[PDB]
Amino acid sequence: RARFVSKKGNCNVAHKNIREQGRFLQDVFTTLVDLKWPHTLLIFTMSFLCSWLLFAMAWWLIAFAHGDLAPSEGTAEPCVTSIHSFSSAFLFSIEVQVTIGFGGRMVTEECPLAILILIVQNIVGLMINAIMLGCIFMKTAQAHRRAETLIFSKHAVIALRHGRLCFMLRVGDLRKSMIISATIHMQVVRKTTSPEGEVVPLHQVDIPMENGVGGNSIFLVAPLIIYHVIDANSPLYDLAPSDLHHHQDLEIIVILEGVVETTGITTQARTSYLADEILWGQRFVPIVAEEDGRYSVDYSKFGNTIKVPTPLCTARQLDEDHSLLEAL
Amino acid sequence: RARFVSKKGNCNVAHKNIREQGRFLQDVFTTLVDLKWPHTLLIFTMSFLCSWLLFAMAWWLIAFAHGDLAPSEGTAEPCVTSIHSFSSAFLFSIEVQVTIGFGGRMVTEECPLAILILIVQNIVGLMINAIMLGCIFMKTAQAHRRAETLIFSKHAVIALRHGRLCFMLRVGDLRKSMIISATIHMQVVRKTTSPEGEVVPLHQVDIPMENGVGGNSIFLVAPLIIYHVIDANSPLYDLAPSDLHHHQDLEIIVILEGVVETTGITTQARTSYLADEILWGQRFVPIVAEEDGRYSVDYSKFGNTIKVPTPLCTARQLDEDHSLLEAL
Amino acid sequence: RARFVSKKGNCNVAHKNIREQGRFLQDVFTTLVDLKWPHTLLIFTMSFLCSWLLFAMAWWLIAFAHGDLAPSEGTAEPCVTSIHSFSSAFLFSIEVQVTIGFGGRMVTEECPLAILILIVQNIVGLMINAIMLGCIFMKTAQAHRRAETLIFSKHAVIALRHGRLCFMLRVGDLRKSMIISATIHMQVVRKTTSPEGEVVPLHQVDIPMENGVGGNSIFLVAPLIIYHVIDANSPLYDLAPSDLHHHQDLEIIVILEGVVETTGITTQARTSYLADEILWGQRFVPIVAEEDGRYSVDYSKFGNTIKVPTPLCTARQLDEDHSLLEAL
Amino acid sequence: RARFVSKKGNCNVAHKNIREQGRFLQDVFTTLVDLKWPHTLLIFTMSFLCSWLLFAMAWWLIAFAHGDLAPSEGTAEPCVTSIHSFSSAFLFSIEVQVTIGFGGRMVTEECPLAILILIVQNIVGLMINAIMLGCIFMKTAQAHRRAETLIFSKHAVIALRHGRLCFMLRVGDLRKSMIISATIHMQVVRKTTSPEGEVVPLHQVDIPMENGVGGNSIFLVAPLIIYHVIDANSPLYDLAPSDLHHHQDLEIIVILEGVVETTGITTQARTSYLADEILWGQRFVPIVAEEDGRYSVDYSKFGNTIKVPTPLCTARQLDEDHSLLEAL
Amino acid sequence: KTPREVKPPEDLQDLGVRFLQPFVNLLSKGTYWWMNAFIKTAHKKPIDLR
Numbered sequence A, B, C, D: 001r002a003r004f005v006s007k008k009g010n011c012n013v014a015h016k017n018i019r020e021q022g023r024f025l026q027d028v029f030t031t032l033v034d035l036k037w038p039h040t041l042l043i044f045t046m047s048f049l050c051s052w053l054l055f056a057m058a059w060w061l062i063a064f065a066h067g068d069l070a071p072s073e074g075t076a077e078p079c080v081t082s083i084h085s086f087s088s089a090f091l092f093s094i095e096v097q098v099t100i101g102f103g104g105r106m107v108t109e110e111c112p113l114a115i116l117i118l119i120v121q122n123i124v125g126l127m128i129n130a131i132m133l134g135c136i137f138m139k140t141a142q143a144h145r146r147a148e149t150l151i152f153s154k155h156a157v158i159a160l161r162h163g164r165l166c167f168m169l170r171v172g173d174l175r176k177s178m179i180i181s182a183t184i185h186m187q188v189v190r191k192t193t194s195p196e197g198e199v200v201p202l203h204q205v206d207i208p209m210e211n212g213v214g215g216n217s218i219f220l221v222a223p224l225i226i227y228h229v230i231d232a233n234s235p236l237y238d239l240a241p242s243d244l245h246h247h248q249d250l251e252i253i254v255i256l257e258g259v260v261e262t263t264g265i266t267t268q269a270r271t272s273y274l275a276d277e278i279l280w281g282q283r284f285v286p287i288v289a290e291e292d293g294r295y296s297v298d299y300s301k302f303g304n305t306i307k308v309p310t311p312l313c314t315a316r317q318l319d320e321d322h323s324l325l326e327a328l
Numbered sequence E: 001k002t003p004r005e006v007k008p009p010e011d012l013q014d015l016g017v018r019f020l021q022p023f024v025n026l027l028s029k030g031t032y033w034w035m036n037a038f039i040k041t042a043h044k045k046p047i048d049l050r
């Protein structure tokens, strides 16, 4: 009995034997973007090191083939001025590819092959530099830094609203930065079965949020309560108190999707509630108060609730007894 | 009695005692993007200064450990050519990291440790340069410059349309640049209460705009009027004239969300109307006229309205008297 | 009698007396992005010229204040090596800010103020370079190059479908590159009036496309036909043949919004049809044929139609005569 | 009889005689982005080569017009120091435009025209560099690397659910990286005909997915089953077993659209099923199992199904016999 | 693995209504910088019991 999604958005499911291989040479960029910072740093640094050393070996080898390390006779001019050790060729490669070019060690017309090497190293340097910079960009424009500030109470409560027994939960945003088109997809998951008999382990039913329009967008500035009204079409219409417990196959997946204000990109936070975390018969205490010329969202006691009794039977038996009391 | 959102989109709510801390080392980028220009400028400048000075101290210390400042004997060759003062090492660090490299002061093979320092400073320079450039990019691609041009009249009017009493307001876009998928979410907010008794300070009900399709997208080229038809399902169906006033707990939050034409990113403008700004019984005068071979949106007198009487009772009592007059 | 939107997406409406001013210092970037290429080019070039010349004057002035142009006595060392003309200081500024740094003219420790100037010019150079590069990026990632390939026949036809009289038009995409979430918002516009009497010049009614789901998304690969079924709720339900003509106040605004495949950004194409372009009683001839092992979209004769008669009365009178013939 | 879309998302339709031409000078960027890597590489490399050689010819010509190749008299100073061969001018151009600037060959005040050439080459170098880097960025941020991991079983099955005969298919995502706002647009396509008689070759009907809300978004973590309930409004309500076959004009286009998690951009995968691939009377075997403290999605046997009988008649005749058995 | 993270009364037990030194550092606890802030409003606005 695992959690489908962790209380912090971790999709707690392993793949175990994908058939095929990955992307030929594009998975490099995607797998590069989302990755721990020091590892990415190290990869780029070591790319620069290998690019420098490779052409360093190249220049050194060229100077040595030109017969330029031994003679120093004064007459024959080098392919590249004043290099006498592999250290020299390495300094030269760094000067070239980093576009520093001090000048004490400089390419000469005496070796057109050396000119080819220069062109090659410049092209490679620009290509690798642009790749590194595009990667560093799309990494520094990363999302899900905000997706951690989007908080959700550890518990969800049900209560009576409009004479109806509706499942609720409070949502929370901690950043003053605003999410755009914030959309809710509450989704109950269990191992359910069709009448014909087929059962699927993680079945998924999009349970609709009760919105005056009916849509799924919200406008979260002050951390509010998301809630579903349990209708005879809702799968939770057979739910009862004391049926919920950490050993009851039951879970409602909560999805929050919107656009970051500063970065036009989209992020998603996930939270889940299995049966026990769904507290029966409570109400989230209002954590907002009219401050002195302001609205005071007391973020303390954020998910703190209050217990309230209720008819301790299914919304099914709710409508049963209600019809029996109304047709009387 | 504060305004939930200012007449200019300011979410006038303080947080006051968030539990946890921020993002470990990613909040740096987000908090960096949206920030006053001179402060960001200064931060980057001072990053470059500290990066230059640190390696300046490094090079100076290396020259001094090599015993290269005192002798000038002519025989022993320096780690780096021709540096005699910390000023020299600082100029050298600037030449290196900015990739200038004049040449009068140049790295030599005599100190492999100096070669290590060179590699280190080049790597750090490229990393810091890419970070600064990614930040400057995602800052210069900033939104909400357009979100200020999206204007909204200081007042909203109600009138009779289709024999029905519908709340209205005019929207305005001042830029010829177009917003894509411009979507409206009018949302009334007050301290309302369920029948069971629970009250929430800033309750939020998405009041649906009257759209021929029913959706919430618009196509704003000429500044038009957004309006809600007040039905028995609308919370405003108990509203009456003279109930609106600046001391009546009431406010309707207006959200505009779309994609900037030039920058594929999304922006959001906010405006709000509490009870008094909701002028009762008026109509926004048509500010458009068929120009000479053109459509003349007289942006002057933009929110200027005209007073019109109306049955001065609730849409509830409207339908009451209407049913009494139709079933007669 | 102007066209609201040109047959090529031009919003043919002038603003004429916006009240306020523009964006303080952010409108620069937005107004910079969407702008004719040579003008933007020239602006950046001239920015580089002014940045070079300003510091050129700076360096020249410093050399002249140091008393470094006249003496050439050999003893006193310059602030910067070997500059003798303003041309020299200008070459030096270019070498510095472009990060070339040949070396023949080089900063010296003899003037700490010159070191300050160097730091200043490097910081300014990096800032201006990043700004220019961010602008060039968001300009080269520009949209609406695709929005021109999204073609629309010059005419729209009505016909009978499902025994119903539905307004139609063919859509066209010419690029093999795919649009994502391609969404249609047909929108009829005219100078219409409420029963209470208020008239608005460019009134706008979102006329819903007939989609099996009901939504507004399409999947355009082969150029297909968009169509509206004219119901008693459609404003076009009072339309009749011979009522359409280029002097009949009538126009239906067609909006296409989706995401470019290569660039995740969104684009919008617009086309409009006033009364005459709405051909009465025709059908777009199928321009697709099953090619040899392929689907042949004959893009030729793209908007070519075929005439078909029809009951030449309003959909109102259509349902009138239909009810009279069915209740017979 | 071709496939509309290949089993791997290829839109198997040719255009054949687009009327007009392309985009004046913007199609360059779009056509540049999506393009095979080596070709793009080569284009950029050769752009750098031509930019270098052009100014190389320029500098060489200037030195030759200055009468600077022949004399070497010692008195007259060159436009640019120490160039004697076109090879020299080419090395110089590379040093300049790549911002290396060794120093052995350096611009001098003796030729203001040479200063103009320097300014020109620097401006051109920066412009071309920014263009290349923007292109390399928007190419390295490319999508549809993920769109290949979004897998779909080679077959679709129908079965009985809720006493109803609903068309199904399993969806699959292989990356742990998450898709946001994953939306399904199943769309049946055939050569169908209105009652009035018009037939269109590739007609397209958006067949709605059965979702508890009714919308088209999903939350795909474990590869699940997408399904349509065949109602009297579904076009498939006249479908029968043994009517499906690879020579039956029939195909259901399946569209998956969402936002990549790391890159806020949107991607789309396509898959299609013609009549035979639609296996009649089966059920996809549940490939998920409760692992040891985990959910085990056995990705092996991914699309493996199991055969189950069913009433072998149309959903039409299903409701016929069902009404006959219920009204009995 | 164990942060032994926290139970800070300075913010938590305060709950948002407090006037004293603990949240302030020892430095201000000697030099009344927080009290400087407290007096800062007393110029722009007359103090009240709420």
Ligand SMILES: Nc1ncnc2c1ncn2[C@@H]1O[C@H](COP(=O)(O)OP(=O)(O)OP(=O)(O)O)[C@@H](O)[C@H]1O
Binding pocket: A151, A152, A153, A154, A155, A174, A299, A300, A301, A302, A303, A304, B017, B018, B019, B020
């Ligand atoms: N005042 C707060 N500010 C910010 N985040 C909070 C706050 N209270 C709780 N959270 C976060 O919300 C998540 C679940 O909230 P929960 O309802 O469990 O709060 P809690 O642990 O009961 O604390 P409290 O009793 O103060 O609400 C936790 O992971 C926690 O980090």
Ligand SMILES: Nc1ncnc2c1ncn2[C@@H]1O[C@H](COP(=O)(O)OP(=O)(O)OP(=O)(O)O)[C@@H](O)[C@H]1O
Binding pocket: B151, B152, B153, B154, B155, B174, B298, B299, B300, B301, B302, B303, B304, C017, C018, C019, C020
């Ligand atoms: N002609 C206009 N062009 C652009 N913005 C305007 C114009 N008129 C008003 N606005 C903006 O709309 C906002 C609210 O509009 P409002 O209806 O108050 O206009 P107003 O102050 O009554 O001026 P007017 O009487 O000209 O409409 C104001 O903040 C103002 O900046």
Ligand SMILES: Nc1ncnc2c1ncn2[C@@H]1O[C@H](COP(=O)(O)OP(=O)(O)OP(=O)(O)O)[C@@H](O)[C@H]1O
Binding pocket: C151, C152, C153, C154, C155, C174, C298, C299, C300, C301, C302, C303, C304, D017, D018, D019, D020
């Ligand atoms: N085969 C085609 N390929 C691409 N674009 C086309 C084609 N035919 C027309 N267009 C474009 O569509 C727009 C309106 O099409 P329209 O129905 O007027 O075509 P047309 O001028 O009648 O030509 P034809 O008679 O070939 O359809 C025009 O601006 C035109 O550029």
Ligand SMILES: Nc1ncnc2c1ncn2[C@@H]1O[C@H](COP(=O)(O)OP(=O)(O)OP(=O)(O)O)[C@@H](O)[C@H]1O
Binding pocket: A017, A018, A019, A020, D151, D152, D153, D154, D155, D174, D299, D300, D301, D302, D303, D304
């Ligand atoms: N275990 C798997 N992991 C990843 N991809 C798979 C797997 N099985 C099939 N696919 C992919 O799904 C596509 C269609 O799946 P299909 O139902 O044909 O699987 P299959 O070939 O029958 O293999 P199997 O019998 O294991 O399902 C194929 O192109 C294949 O690459």
